[PDB]
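Reviewers asked in the last cycle whether our approach scales beyond single polypeptides. To address this, we selected a multi-component target totalling 678 residues and predicted its structure end to end. The input consisted of the following lines:
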Amino acid sequence: NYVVAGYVSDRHLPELTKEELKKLTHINIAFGHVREDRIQTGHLQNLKLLPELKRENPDLTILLSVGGWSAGGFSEAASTEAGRQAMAESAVRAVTEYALDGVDLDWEYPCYAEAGIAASPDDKANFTLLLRTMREALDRQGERDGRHYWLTIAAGADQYYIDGTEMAEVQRYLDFVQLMTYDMRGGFQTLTGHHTNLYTGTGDLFRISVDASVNLFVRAGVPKEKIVIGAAFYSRMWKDVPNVNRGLYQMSPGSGGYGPDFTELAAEYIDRNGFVRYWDEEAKAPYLFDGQTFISYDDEMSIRYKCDYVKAQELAGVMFWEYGCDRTHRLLDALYQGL
Amino acid sequence: NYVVAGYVSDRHLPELTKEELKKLTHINIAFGHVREDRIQTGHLQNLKLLPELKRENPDLTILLSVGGWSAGGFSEAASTEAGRQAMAESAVRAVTEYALDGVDLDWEYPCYAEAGIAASPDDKANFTLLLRTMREALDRQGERDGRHYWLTIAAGADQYYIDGTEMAEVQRYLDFVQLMTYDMRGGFQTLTGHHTNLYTGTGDLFRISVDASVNLFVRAGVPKEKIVIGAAFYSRMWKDVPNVNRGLYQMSPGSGGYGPDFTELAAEYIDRNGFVRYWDEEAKAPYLFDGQTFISYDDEMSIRYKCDYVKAQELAGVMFWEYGCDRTHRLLDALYQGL
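The resulting structure, written as structure tokens, was:
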């Protein structure tokens, strides 16, 4: 058995069907927020639907994901014992108020303020203390309730994330670590490349990939059986790039912003409207180029390669962002079949 | 004794004074080019001045630097035995036609086409073969002439460069390896940071620095006594950055292009015209910010720290780009005093 974990925005919860629910092992609900050192759920609208989802697939684990890109409050909460206890208490509140099986913490990222949030060098030690305290509180509630409650994280994929955390300690408190092996090239670079590539390609100045990320986290002390890799149901896109090398590893005037989601790629871009699909046999990744606009994405082909890698390397499974980005339903099917 | 090596454009050779020449151990003349698999010098104008420069400082070693950013022809020449022999023959031509002591090869970079030049995965093996062949030819000419002829390279600072070369083999043919520990953050990223920083700073998504680069090359098999680190007499600059964290580690709409040279920074920017100088005590690097425009540079303070690092770590010395970028003469003086 492997993890098949899908991020689902609260807004998309009613769109889940029984057939889709049976293909997932986990749903990560996006997103709770942090205010006053506590996880907040009051803005989420569809949490009353959770018992019915669990009835449709009783093997499904439903986590509340807390944070996301630009969600603040984490460095502040982790900086004091009081704030770490408050976060732990609010995680317990979430799993007792709603049919939630645990919490997925998505602080992006300890020590890093680039998303417009507070950060501190103290976050490296404080993140470990925060997760320990949250795990302690969730375990106490699981003792009361006669069950297990889950704690996971979503982690950045590259060296910076290892440098800002103590992953050998962090992993001890987590059921698994989800490596966000997407947006690996995106809004901070003007060089085109693959945003969610299985392997690193020759000629790329940037050296990250799923394979390189897994290796970093294994060497940092995360057991392979706890590593869940990432698939993206959407693209990253660079504009006004020279018509050289099919747009790959070329300089844009701007960074790689979000491109079309997979729904829109299938409808409007893949081998259409001047865009040609190319396959990078080294990276195991597809890309589109029309002579000027470069688009990096995941498809059924790269997903199959990612699944084969999970099996061969004995990893935990795969997660994806995000359910609503592929209304063709093909990418979830490919993940389910591959694992 | 330490290497004090300065890049000097051919156009700036007549500006060299005796006092400056006595402070340098090496001059790298920028730049010869590659055409038809051969080093070309016909566009350079001041090579007849070299005997007088050597007369003024008989201990000075004068190298011809070949290549530079966007200079093509290297992957093509290195791809065949004929082209490798042609490069070697043309290096011998350079040192017999002019008062040159050797060649500094500045291919940027083997396996990488990002500068708008040809590249191939075969460059990794072919670069070693090219340097071996050039060293063999230069040694044969040194045997005829009763002297040593030099061969060095300028190398990219980050992981990509290690991945595109065989540095443990490459180093055997070189008098030293100049690590271009500048432009380390620049035209490929929209996140601000230090372009020529001694140490890596907390909170930077990008993890390179002089210290990290030296460690990469040592681990790749370059002896410390062959490592020459880099200082920059000019800035990298990002525009329209949020007024947060003094501009450091903030996102710009564009990449880090060239900023003012040190002459212009001293005249117009350092603690002037709204720009405040800050010192990063972790990275050992100065930076300027006026609330909107972020400028990274080297000064006498960071240069002293770089020199102390060279001495403590037992490296070969320091090189700089480029002589004409600092008409205050202070940065060369700081380097000379520090070593």
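Chain A touches chain B through 33 residues (CB under 8 Å). We regard this as preliminary and will revisit it once experimental data from Aim 1 are available.
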